[model samples]
Target chain A: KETAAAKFERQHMDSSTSAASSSNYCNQMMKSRNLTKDRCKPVNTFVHESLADVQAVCSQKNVACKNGQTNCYQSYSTMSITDCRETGSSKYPNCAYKTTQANKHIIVACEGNPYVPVHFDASV
Target chain B: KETAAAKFERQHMDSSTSAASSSNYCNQMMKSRNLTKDRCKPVNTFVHESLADVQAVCSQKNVACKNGQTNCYQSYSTMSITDCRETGSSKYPNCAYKTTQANKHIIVACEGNPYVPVHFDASV
Candidate 1:
């Protein structure tokens, strides 16, 4: 009964991996993280910033969510992150990923009490 | 910029295609929804439930998010949802998906002022 919040963390968070120093980062991380299970996820992001800093984005600035919702927010500061995309030859059980690191402002959807981030919508 | 919330709507929300009586629902809907643009999304879910119902899940009984966050919640009532999984034959520009319809409780992460759903975490 893993909750959505936890699922988000599992799929998106990677506070320890500060740099994409190796090409194999994604191929290994994606599998180690279990995103390669059932099937390879096509595209995903891993945040390299601290959880607190990431959560603070919810209150930095208001923005329209891609879904047309008004509850989305963009981080004021650029954060380190890695984008993982499955290679063209990627096949389930033989998942391969291309990892790219960049500094970008992340956009997340916020809700509920205390105004914390609920979903990692995207990184721009 | 298209916000994450808007992205969520683009990628996850679908109120019109209900019955999923056709196998090509995912194939057509995924393309029509623009999820097949640069690449095919590996796995995604289209919720047939109303927006209000989806949002209300945040207020239902609290549960641990899969990421181990405590802010996640599960819906009290079962919801109608369509799961789109990339088929083995799927290829770039020729993306294909297997559509599955089921009644299940949805899990979502909540945040912000009104404590509404900010992310469609998963369905189970």
Candidate 2:
């Protein structure tokens, strides 16, 4: 039973490395991170920032969550991130992905206990 | 810049809920959780277990992550959970989902600080 808070870290947090310049970054990560298991995860984003900075976004600007809730927050600064997209030829147990690096402000849905971030809504 | 840890709480944590008797649970939750705006999130699970129980899985049984990482763990006890699956007729802005309740042991990936659970690999 994985918690929502924990899932957010596994799929999005990447504070250990900022080297998202390589073209194969997503390919390696999507596999190494295990998002390419039973089936390839179509799209995912990994942020190259500290957990504290990511958490602080909950207290930043307010925005509407995709579901039309007002609990979403946008990052005040552009952060380093890697976008992983599954390729059309991707097959289970042999998932392939395309990696793209970008610096963008992220939007996230926050809730519960200290009102911290809980979901990666999107990046803009 | 939402951390993987936080995202888990939003999409999965439901300590306040143990009910999954209604068939419309996924339809309401997928949207209420904001996983159906741009597009419907295909599949997701919400655990009704406490945060501590979820975290304790990290020390339960060692398993392989989807990406072949050996940092995954399986829960010792079967837990209450609701599986949300997008239906074939699901459309943006009016997404639909099929809700299913099951008692199963979840597999999750764990990493970093105190070696906590991070990703929802699967349930079995």
Candidate 3:
């Protein structure tokens, strides 16, 4: 039973990867994380930060989610991250993706008992 | 190990109760499902159908999710349902929801091995 927080980490948290140095980051990571099985996940972000550091965002400013819910929060400090997008050439199981590395603040929706991030909302 | 499929059922399926018979359906159902915890789940829909009946939606016409997921499908038949919405006067632990019963076609996102509904996308 993977919790939402764990799934968030699996899909978006890449604490140890030096994705900024690799253009093939998403091509491998997306598949490794199982985000490209039945369908390729259209868009995703990978945060290069420690779990504790990212979890603390739950205690930051409460803001609106990428869409509507106000359970989200924005990180105060900028962090290194990688953005992944499905390329037009992608196909099932062999889902192809383009990767872009950037430095920015991230937003996430927090939930559950420990109130950790459950969804990656946005980055800027 | 509550799978997303199981969680979806705990949150959205209410096959036995005659919710349309009670004006206080949301008050009881929402609380019973443990949706009103540290904060209230603002909006939710409960389907009045058997597990097998709902799972059949995965084999229906493919469509986009309410947001953007190609895994979603729309049921061909209209089904009975109850929508629960939080009221302005509502507060945590006392999630006051207004209930409305409707008959409509449903949309759901299917995933994983069982290929069952994991999200209640929309109803129309």
Candidate 4:
């Protein structure tokens, strides 16, 4: 199974635009700092929806990673937009994290902490 | 997540009926000698009360082919009851598959294939 991180990276890269204003949600929010034109996506995608849906797809076709074992099985720590400043992006990238409807752990953090959710634009 | 036919004949199908004397049973009674009414339920729905609950449902559901490997992963083959003659069903529909007692699959086939231990009933 692919970790939440990998899934986000694939889709984000596919939809990334070169300009800051034109940047996709993954780029605009996942990157810690504003970016110019990078091509990396978060490793995971989390929505307020059930992790069940994403788990199905990942278990079937991707590899997954858990948060630190301490909280990995129990709950996610918090949600925030991590900037690309620390992740080494030529362009900026960012990801958002939120608890699942069930308040379950690891709510799609696909980057540094493994809890950030990858963002996708409806138009893209 | 889909399974046996898709995961593990694992190739397959299911039947839903609610009458022994109502004639629906005989009409669907394995339709031997010569057959009729195409697109019905299963070519299979084998319940081995001996085995346990969960495994029964994973092995059926939709489609009609084993997943991508050996045995079709090895009993090498496997079904449900469509005899219609002595077939168990629901006034609600056909009954055998939906059991109330069950455990979920942990290894994979993770389609959320609700281990239908008991069947639901139709209106009286």
Candidate 5:
């Protein structure tokens, strides 16, 4: 049984690796974790940190989420992350992606009583 | 804007194929489609028919869903499908599955005004 918070972690967190991960990392990870479900997600980020660390970001500050909700926050410390963006030459049933490694402050939208990230807003 | 109905289709439906598909189809399709997200879902079936065909099942006959709701329906005709079940040796983060191919009358639970499948219940 998966909750909303658990779904976020499953889709975005992979603590074993770092920003220096491989170029093909996104191609493999995107599909493995199911982000490339249908037509590729366009853009996604996989963070290389413990789930607790990402959860803590929810308590740092109150910022407006992309959709104009006040449940979002930006991490104070930079975190290792990989961004996956679909290549324009790609098509459905044959998802392709471009991977880039980075260490940056992440933004996420949180929710629930014991709040936690439910969306990966952005990384900068 | 994807809805609950749309999500069900993204995760379960894949036309243009049949039960006679390749043996490794599950390995490739499952990962590509994201059903193997955090873990290999214990059991799942992919319908090899048009989304319309599956949608029409909602109007065939109403029955109690597994959860005991009366929103479920059984398709009148057998359709090609592939079942993906997690292998005994399967573990989280390294989802592995065993596949079986067959043609069966599918069972689905549906919802919404223009009613459509929300859950792929079973097949026989």
Candidate 6:
């Protein structure tokens, strides 16, 4: 179960594609300064016992508010149904996910009767 | 007093910042074409009775997901507290607000002893 903070650190901190020393600098800050940064807290826009509810929120029309795109509807949940394709084998078991920063949608997939809860952490 | 579509159209359509005819193009499309675009469906991420409740939602941890910035907590509301500074005086003494697209936060201010609701309209 990956936490949102871990994901946040990965996405925001790793915006740097190079400079191992730059990354190491932050690591040093974390070790010595005891930086009170990156405190973990729950960010739940909406919670559900099952994934079906989350999907419903994603498929809503207003959620896809394109400028000239007709048939637009509002969906509060930010899950993308477009790229929700994957295949799993026994060893890898096909657990993968994709997210688009442009659309701000995340798709999570897993195998083997999993209990997965999707979380969203956004800064405003 | 102002509706969400009015604000949305002003923000999105007016991106041109150009000729009046260019501006009138959409209006003509609206009047003659009856394009059936912009049906004015509600895009309400959250609704509240008072501004304080909305403000509380704005200032919470985890909502500001940033790297190396600590004491963060998760909040669900898409609102901007930074631009919340406003002074409302009767008869146009002072009543205004600001919003930031980069941060995805909206700050709304108005005058009078009023019932004001802030609505967030976003795609994806």
Q: Estimate each model's TM-score.
A: 0.49, 0.50, 0.49, 0.22, 0.50, 0.20
Candidate 6 CAPRI category:
incorrect
Model 5, position B35, has a per-residue lDDT of 65
Off-target runs (Cα >4 Å) in candidate 6 are A1-114, A117-124, B1-90, B93-118, B121-124
Q: How many angstroms is residue A76 displaced in model 4 relative to the true structure, after the best TM-score fit?
A: 26
lDDT of 5 by residue, B14-118 (tens): 663455356666775566455677667777777878678999999996778888888899999999888888888888778777778888999899989888898
Q: What digit string (tens of lDDT, one per residue) describes model 1 on residues A1-124?
A: 8665556656776654367678887886676456787899999998877667877888898999988999999999999999999999989889999999999999988876656677777888
Q: lDDT (CA) for every model shown?
A: 0.78, 0.81, 0.83, 0.28, 0.78, 0.27
Tens-digit lDDT track of model 2 for A1-124: 7667666776777665564767877775565455775678999999888778998999999999999999999999988888888888877777778888889999989888867777999999
Q: How would you encode candidate 6's per-residue C-alpha lDDT over A43-98 as one tens digit per residue?
A: 11212112344334334433222334232333354432211111232122222222
Model 2 Cα shift for residue B45 (angstroms): 35
TM-score ranking from best to worst? Answer: 2, 5, 3, 1, 4, 6
Query: Which CAPRI level is candidate 3?
Result: incorrect
Clashes of each: 19, 18, 0, 60, 1, 14
Deviation in Å, model 4, residue B71 alpha carbon = 10
Give the Cα-based TM-score of candidate 3 against the true structure. Answer: 0.49
Q: For residues A1-124, what per-residue lDDT tens digits would candidate 4 score against the true structure?
A: 9664565554333223222332244344444322222634433232332232332121121123343322111121221222222234333323332211112223232224323434332110
Docking class of 1: incorrect
- Model 6 TM-score? 0.20
Model 4 interface DockQ? 0.02
| Best-fitting candidate, scored by lDDT | 3
Which of 4 and 5 is the better model by DockQ? 4
The digit string of per-residue lDDT tens for model 3 on B9-84 reads 9999989965466779999989989899768999999999877668767745567886786888776567789999
The complex in candidate 1 yields a DockQ of 0.02
Share of native interface contacts recovered by each model: 0.00, 0.00, 0.00, 0.00, 0.00, 0.00
Give model 1's clash tally.
19
Q: What does the lDDT read for residue A91 in candidate 4?
A: 33
The alpha-carbon lDDT assigned to residue B28 of candidate 3 equals 90
DockQ of each: 0.02, 0.02, 0.01, 0.02, 0.01, 0.02
TM-score of chain A of each: 0.92, 0.93, 0.92, 0.20, 0.93, 0.21
